[PDB]
Amino acid sequence: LSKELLAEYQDLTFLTKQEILLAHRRFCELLPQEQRSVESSLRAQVPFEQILSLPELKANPFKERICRVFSTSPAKDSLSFEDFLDLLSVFSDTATPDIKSHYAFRIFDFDDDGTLNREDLSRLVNCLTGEGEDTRLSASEMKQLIDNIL
Ligand SMILES: [Mg+2]
């Protein structure tokens, strides 16, 4: 489903509390001492440089998409508390795969036109099949199969 499903989650609290505890400390480890107080973390965002610690984003080198797409801020390089938590919630593959699809989709979808564009289409079957590997090789054959399923 579209942001319609997640829209209901964020507007709620599907996010656990324990995970938050870790963020308060575990993360404050990379944040200055004068910021160790979660009090300044609710307004302060996590610098991209430090975010490199979160493997969740490792999915794509230039997470620049996570900042702008996942978060709506001018910096576009500092995960803010706001969504940060909401991310862990929506990132819950509890329900069917549909939820997961939205997770990886929105993240991989930088344009967000309403479907998988050449941009996502690649990064997509790329991670699954494995760009430049055994599966599909260097070529446009990615259209033959993708078109065979559609
Ligand atoms: Mg797209």
From Swiss-Prot:
Topology term for the membrane: Lipid-anchor
Outcome recorded upon mutating I146A: Loss of binding to ITGA2B
UniProt KW Transmembrane keyword: no
GO biological process: one example: positive regulation of cell migration
Reported disease: Epidermodysplasia verruciformis 3: A form of epidermodysplasia verruciformis, a rare genodermatosis associated with a high risk of skin carcinoma that results from an abnormal susceptibility to infection by specific human papillomaviruses, including the oncogenic HPV5. Infection leads to the early development of disseminated flat wart-like and pityriasis versicolor-like skin lesions. Cutaneous Bowen's carcinomas in situ and invasive squamous cell carcinomas develop in about half of the patients, mainly on sun-exposed skin areas. EV3 inheritance is autosomal recessive.
Name this polypeptide is given: Calcium and integrin-binding protein 1
Subcellular location(s) of the protein: Membrane; Cell membrane, Sarcolemma; Cell membrane; Apical cell membrane
Anything else known: The binding of either calcium or magnesium significantly increases the structural stability of the protein in comparison to apo-CIB (calcium- and magnesium-free form).
Expression triggers: Up-regulated during breast cancer progression.
Superkingdom classification of source: Eukaryota
Impact upon substituting S71E: Phosphomimetic; promotes tumor growth by an indirect mechanism; in isoform 2
UniProt keyword list: Angiogenesis, Apoptosis, Calcium, Cell adhesion, Cell cycle, Cell division, Cell membrane, Cell projection, Cytoplasm, Cytoskeleton, Differentiation, Golgi apparatus, Lipoprotein, Magnesium, Membrane, Metal-binding, Myristate, Nucleus, Phosphoprotein, Repeat, Spermatogenesis
Outcome, altering L124 to A/T: Loss of binding to ITGA2B
Annotated organism of origin: Homo sapiens (Human)
Annotated GO MF terms: calcium ion binding; calcium-dependent protein kinase inhibitor activity; magnesium ion binding; protein serine/threonine kinase inhibitor activity; protein-membrane adaptor activity; small GTPase binding; transmembrane transporter binding
Biological role: Calcium-binding protein that plays a role in the regulation of numerous cellular processes, such as cell differentiation, cell division, cell proliferation, cell migration, thrombosis, angiogenesis, cardiac hypertrophy and apoptosis. Involved in bone marrow megakaryocyte differentiation by negatively regulating thrombopoietin-mediated signaling pathway. Participates in the endomitotic cell cycle of megakaryocyte, a form of mitosis in which both karyokinesis and cytokinesis are interrupted.
Amino acids binding Ca(2+) 1: D109, D111, D113, T115, D120
Gene Ontology, cellular component aspect: apical plasma membrane; axon; cell periphery; centrosome; cytoplasm; endoplasmic reticulum; extracellular exosome; filopodium tip
Stretches of the chain forming a coiled coil according to its record: none
Subunit structure: Monomer. Interacts with MYO1C. Interacts (via C-terminal region) with PPP3R1 and CACNA1C; the interactions increase upon cardiomyocytes hypertrophy. Interacts with the heterodimeric integrin alpha-IIb/beta3 (ITGA2B-ITGB3). Interacts with ITGA2B (via cytoplasmic domain); the interaction is direct and calcium-dependent. Interacts with the protein kinases PLK2/SNK and PRKDC (via the region immediately upstream of the kinase domain). Interacts with PLK3; the interaction inhibits PLK3 kinase activity. Interacts with PSEN2. Interacts (via C-terminus) with F8. Interacts with NBR1 (via C-terminus).
Domain EF-hand: residue ranges: 96-131
